[PDB]
Design an enzyme around this catalytic site. Sequence first.
Site, short mmCIF file in Angstrom:
data_model
loop_
_atom_site.label_atom_id
_atom_site.label_comp_id
_atom_site.label_asym_id
_atom_site.label_seq_id
_atom_site.Cartn_x
_atom_site.Cartn_y
_atom_site.Cartn_z
N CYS A 131 9.40 15.13 -8.92
CA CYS A 131 8.78 16.36 -7.69
C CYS A 131 7.55 16.91 -8.16
O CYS A 131 7.91 17.89 -8.96
CB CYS A 131 9.19 17.07 -6.76
SG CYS A 131 7.91 17.61 -5.43
N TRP A 161 2.67 15.99 1.84
CA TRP A 161 2.16 15.10 2.54
C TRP A 161 1.27 14.22 0.93
O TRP A 161 2.07 14.22 0.26
CB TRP A 161 0.70 16.64 2.75
CG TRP A 161 0.89 17.03 1.24
CD1 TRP A 161 -0.27 16.76 0.19
CD2 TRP A 161 0.58 18.88 1.75
NE1 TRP A 161 0.00 18.15 -0.42
CE2 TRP A 161 0.54 19.37 0.35
CE3 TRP A 161 0.88 19.31 2.69
CZ2 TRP A 161 0.75 20.44 0.05
CZ3 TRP A 161 1.42 21.04 1.99
CH2 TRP A 161 1.23 20.88 0.91
N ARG A 170 5.82 20.55 -7.08
CA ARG A 170 7.47 21.59 -6.16
C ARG A 170 6.71 22.86 -6.14
O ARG A 170 7.50 23.38 -6.03
CB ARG A 170 8.19 21.69 -7.13
CG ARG A 170 9.54 20.77 -7.35
CD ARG A 170 10.26 20.23 -7.89
NE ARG A 170 9.77 19.39 -8.86
CZ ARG A 170 10.45 20.13 -10.24
NH1 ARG A 170 11.55 20.55 -10.59
NH2 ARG A 170 10.12 19.54 -11.69
N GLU A 221 0.49 7.36 -4.89
CA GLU A 221 1.17 6.57 -4.08
C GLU A 221 0.93 5.85 -3.33
O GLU A 221 1.13 4.77 -3.31
CB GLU A 221 1.62 7.92 -3.42
CG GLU A 221 2.95 9.38 -4.18
CD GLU A 221 3.98 10.04 -2.95
OE1 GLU A 221 2.48 11.40 -2.70
OE2 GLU A 221 4.91 9.53 -3.00
C1 HEM Z 1 4.34 18.94 -0.34
C2 HEM Z 1 3.36 17.40 -0.30
C3 HEM Z 1 4.53 16.57 -1.74
C4 HEM Z 1 3.63 16.17 -2.73
C5 HEM Z 1 2.18 15.80 -3.01
C6 HEM Z 1 5.00 15.32 -3.24
C7 HEM Z 1 4.83 14.81 -4.01
C8 HEM Z 1 5.95 13.37 -5.17
C9 HEM Z 1 5.86 12.53 -5.53
C10 HEM Z 1 3.80 12.20 -6.22
C11 HEM Z 1 6.59 12.30 -6.24
C12 HEM Z 1 6.56 10.77 -6.89
C13 HEM Z 1 6.87 9.54 -5.82
C14 HEM Z 1 6.17 8.26 -6.83
O1 HEM Z 1 6.30 8.18 -7.85
O2 HEM Z 1 6.50 7.14 -5.85
C15 HEM Z 1 7.56 13.42 -5.44
C16 HEM Z 1 8.77 12.53 -5.65
C17 HEM Z 1 10.16 13.72 -4.58
N1 HEM Z 1 9.72 14.42 -4.06
FE1 HEM Z 1 8.11 15.56 -3.48
N2 HEM Z 1 5.82 15.93 -2.79
C18 HEM Z 1 5.55 16.19 -2.02
C19 HEM Z 1 6.84 17.25 -0.94
C20 HEM Z 1 8.28 16.87 -1.24
C21 HEM Z 1 9.30 17.63 -0.32
C22 HEM Z 1 8.96 18.62 0.85
C23 HEM Z 1 10.60 17.16 -0.96
C24 HEM Z 1 11.59 17.94 -0.52
C25 HEM Z 1 12.37 18.65 0.11
C26 HEM Z 1 10.70 16.83 -2.62
C27 HEM Z 1 10.75 15.65 -3.02
C28 HEM Z 1 10.59 14.81 -3.59
C29 HEM Z 1 11.83 13.97 -3.97
C30 HEM Z 1 13.42 14.19 -4.18
C31 HEM Z 1 11.36 13.38 -5.15
C32 HEM Z 1 11.49 12.36 -6.00
C33 HEM Z 1 12.34 10.65 -4.85
C34 HEM Z 1 12.95 9.63 -5.31
O3 HEM Z 1 13.67 10.39 -6.16
O4 HEM Z 1 12.87 8.58 -5.63
N3 HEM Z 1 8.85 16.58 -2.38
N4 HEM Z 1 6.68 13.76 -4.72
C1 LIG Z 2 12.66 1.44 -4.07
C2 LIG Z 2 12.94 2.45 -4.05
C3 LIG Z 2 13.50 3.59 -4.04
C4 LIG Z 2 14.09 4.86 -3.51
N1 LIG Z 2 15.34 5.32 -3.28
N2 LIG Z 2 13.13 5.34 -3.58
C5 LIG Z 2 11.61 4.91 -4.21
C6 LIG Z 2 10.25 5.60 -4.31
O1 LIG Z 2 10.43 7.36 -4.62
C7 LIG Z 2 10.99 8.25 -3.03
C8 LIG Z 2 9.67 7.81 -2.25
C9 LIG Z 2 7.94 7.96 -2.99
C10 LIG Z 2 7.16 6.42 -3.17
N3 LIG Z 2 6.03 6.94 -3.44
O2 LIG Z 2 7.10 9.00 -2.47
C11 LIG Z 2 7.63 10.09 -2.70
C12 LIG Z 2 7.29 11.66 -1.73
C13 LIG Z 2 8.10 12.52 -1.43
C14 LIG Z 2 7.61 13.13 -0.64
C15 LIG Z 2 8.22 14.26 0.70
C16 LIG Z 2 6.35 13.86 -0.45
C17 LIG Z 2 5.87 12.31 -1.36
N4 LIG Z 2 4.19 12.70 -1.23
N5 LIG Z 2 6.53 11.28 -2.09
C18 LIG Z 2 11.38 2.85 -4.00
#
Ligand code: HEM
Ligand SMILES: Cc1cc(N)nc(COCC[C@@H](CN)OCc2cc(C)cc(N)n2)c1
Lengths: 362, 362
Positions: B65, B237, B68, B242
């Site tokens: 993320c 947000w 953070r 994305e």
């Molecule tokens: C506040 C705005 C937030 C933004 C802009 C943001 C941005 C992102 C982005 C760009 C990613 C990568 C997803 C991708 O590459 O498709 C991500 C992943 C992630 N975010 Fe955030 N995030 C935010 C808030 C949060 C919150 C509130 C949480 C949880 C409490 C969180 C937990 C995560 C997690 C767990 C992932 C990884 C998901 C995975 O492993 O598939 N984020 N975030």
């Molecule tokens: C295929 C697939 C499976 C899986 N478990 N997760 C994904 C994508 O990873 C998590 C979702 C991604 C998609 N851009 O968004 C993460 C995210 C989370 C939050 C809370 C905010 C944000 N802006 N972005 C893809």
Amino acid sequence: EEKEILWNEAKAFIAACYQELGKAAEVKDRLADIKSEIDLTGSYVHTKEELEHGAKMAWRNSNRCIGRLFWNSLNVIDRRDVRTKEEVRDALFHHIETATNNGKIRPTITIFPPEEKGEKQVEIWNHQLIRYAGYESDGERIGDPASCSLTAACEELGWRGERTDFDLLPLIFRMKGDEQPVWYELPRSLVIEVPITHPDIEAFSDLELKWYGVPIISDMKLEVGGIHYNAAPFNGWYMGTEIGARNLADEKRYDKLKKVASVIGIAADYNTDLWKDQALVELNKAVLHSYKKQGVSIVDHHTAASQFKRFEEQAEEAGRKLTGDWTWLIPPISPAATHIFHRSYDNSIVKPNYFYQDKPYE
Amino acid sequence: EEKEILWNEAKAFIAACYQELGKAAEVKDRLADIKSEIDLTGSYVHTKEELEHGAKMAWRNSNRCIGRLFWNSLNVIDRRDVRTKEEVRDALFHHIETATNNGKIRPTITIFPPEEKGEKQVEIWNHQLIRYAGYESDGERIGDPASCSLTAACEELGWRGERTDFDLLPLIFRMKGDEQPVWYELPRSLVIEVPITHPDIEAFSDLELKWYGVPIISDMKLEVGGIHYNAAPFNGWYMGTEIGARNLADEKRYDKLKKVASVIGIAADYNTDLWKDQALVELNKAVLHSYKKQGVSIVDHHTAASQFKRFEEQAEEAGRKLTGDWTWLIPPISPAATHIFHRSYDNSIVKPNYFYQDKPYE
Ligand code: HEM
Ligand SMILES: Cc1cc(N)nc(COCC[C@@H](CN)OCc2cc(C)cc(N)n2)c1
Ligand code: HEM
Ligand SMILES: Cc1cc(N)nc(COCC[C@@H](CN)OCc2cc(C)cc(N)n2)c1
Ligand SMILES: C[C@H](O)[C@H](O)[C@H]1CNc2nc(N)[nH]c(=O)c2N1
Ligand SMILES: C[C@H](O)[C@H](O)[C@H]1CNc2nc(N)[nH]c(=O)c2N1
Ligand SMILES: [Cl-]
Ligand SMILES: [Cl-]
């Protein structure tokens, strides 16, 4: 342990090399000759066939390289016979000339005598055979900042740069026995440079950007079956992003993005306008256009990724394990538009290969 | 071992949580109560203060993320009290409403009862609470391909999609004891969508693109001190990329790049023209412009990277180890223009954290 390290590498390499060359039946007798040679001299000498294929295998194993599809077409120049600095200089001059090939670049490596007891016969100081100087004095920043330390070193040795943004650094290398390296100014007639213009924006030439034609890495060690070729410069052609997304774009390099935004006529005021992204694309378009127009070899990151896919496919068809560094294989521009981004790569190190080594200066 | 696994996690979490909360002196007596509770019941119940900070710690430890920086401002909703599917539904409806906040998005998590013996009390099937359906029949491709399997599952359960490219999937979850999940159609009045327009290219609206306002991840497990909250949807947000570089750009998603190139008036014929790169930038410009114009919260990748730098700085100032996944932290657009690209990150897993879990369908 050193003799043992050498002998174990030699066994592994010869068997693999001869297997690929279909000389499997000759492994036994070669391994014998090599073994007595190591016993006697403390080392062994590669055949030209072993050296050539060894350098090609090394390229094939370079995890960070996207251009590995053409590994088997590498032009290998054997210069293990050099003994004088004039011979080294002319070998380097020759490499530049033959690799450049009037713009139709030939992937080439020139191989100098290997380390003996870890003792270097030839010590090249240049990162690349063709690179621009860099200066900084009282916050007066000129040229390529990445070249700042080598430039200072060269200016210690009696060389002086014109202090343009594109000073060609001299070749600089040290021979075994000599305390100081020597330096030789590059003949301009051998160095192809490309003025950067844009296909439809005329004002782009106001930036007066240019870059050199051929990237010739000259500071890495080629290791082949236990033998350390510390001096073995190699080249391919550029992928555009290397020039337009890094060399001319990085803040710790030429840092041209704001000037680019100005000439293409967009504001550089707001992050949300994505002006750096737009500037990056137009600059990389400019680079590709300019090299193609001058008749200098170059590849775009999409085509290169397509080629690397074919490399992956070739590997599996040939029953070879594929290795790669995902962090280096993705292009710095639109990486998610390539297949590379969407898969994983085993970053295991396989020999033969090219390695980093300590710089002799700084 | 299970009781022991739980007890060891609980010790580590409580000590760390209370330390950060400055409740260090209360660790001893809490650890005692917890220990008897585990002995008696086989588990322990978090205080609201522990749960809240535990979910914030979990976000802070999410290596992938970029957002953070604002970990401590997470809005935590404690719904461990729910027992009926109508209560779950309304909790989910409430989450969408309060997190959306008329466009000024509040980072929010709703926490449902945890697993007991690995037995789920609530089983959410949705990847995100708001997502578009996907269909494929005889190579007739409609909507979001990533949603194809969930959509088929939902259509097994009596739901039927309109088969537009932007069908809102219903909420679908299963309660403990029930064999099948139930589904509830989302109230449109709660779902904010954003029409995609370009700031200076009017023809961009001809593409009829749109996306939903709030990304609400609903398929991950929140683990806090040994306790497995399998049902705990959370949102932030969007970062523009994305939507514009992946959701609308990927060939296995909406695959809109060729149509984008057409509306912005460039040829999509040659790799060297970098038309995909240019299309990607204009599309991502469009996304940011559209969300800002509608008054819906969004962040560009440059600003987000700036914020993540502040997060890194905050971590070191607070004497905390920083962890991260470089491959996920870099934006898919101009990653070399961010500081993230130019450094390394320890990808060590720290708990509390959010984890992948097996999908209940397919
Ligand atoms: C506040 C705005 C937030 C933004 C802009 C943001 C941005 C992102 C982005 C760009 C990613 C990568 C997803 C991708 O590459 O498709 C991500 C992943 C992630 N975010 Fe955030 N995030 C935010 C808030 C949060 C919150 C509130 C949480 C949880 C409490 C969180 C937990 C995560 C997690 C767990 C992932 C990884 C998901 C995975 O492993 O598939 N984020 N975030
Ligand atoms: C295929 C697939 C499976 C899986 N478990 N997760 C994904 C994508 O990873 C998590 C979702 C991604 C998609 N851009 O968004 C993460 C995210 C989370 C939050 C809370 C905010 C944000 N802006 N972005 C893809
Ligand atoms: C034929 C044209 C070639 C292209 C387009 C190409 C492309 C690239 C690119 C883009 C990189 C990444 C560099 C960076 O990110 O800054 C790279 C790395 C590398 N390439 Fe190639 N390459 C080519 C030929 C070769 C040849 C002929 C060799 C050696 C025989 C080679 C060995 C390597 C090595 C060792 C690296 C990693 C350098 C390091 O670790 O710092 N490549 N290549
Ligand atoms: C700071 C630094 C140190 C170091 N040892 N190496 C680097 C950069 O990595 C190697 C040089 C890169 C620069 N784009 O080019 C690799 C390359 C090699 C070849 C043979 C062809 C090609 N197109 N590109 C940077
Ligand atoms: C297979 C490969 O790891 C894959 O492309 C990953 C890594 N990089 C990523 N980076 C981001 N931000 N989002 C992703 O979904 C992915 N996917
Ligand atoms: C520190 C970080 O690993 C650094 O940005 C690396 C990784 N990615 C890269 N990728 C390429 N192609 N070239 C590079 O020089 C780097 N540098
Ligand atoms: Cl370079
Ligand atoms: Cl998404």
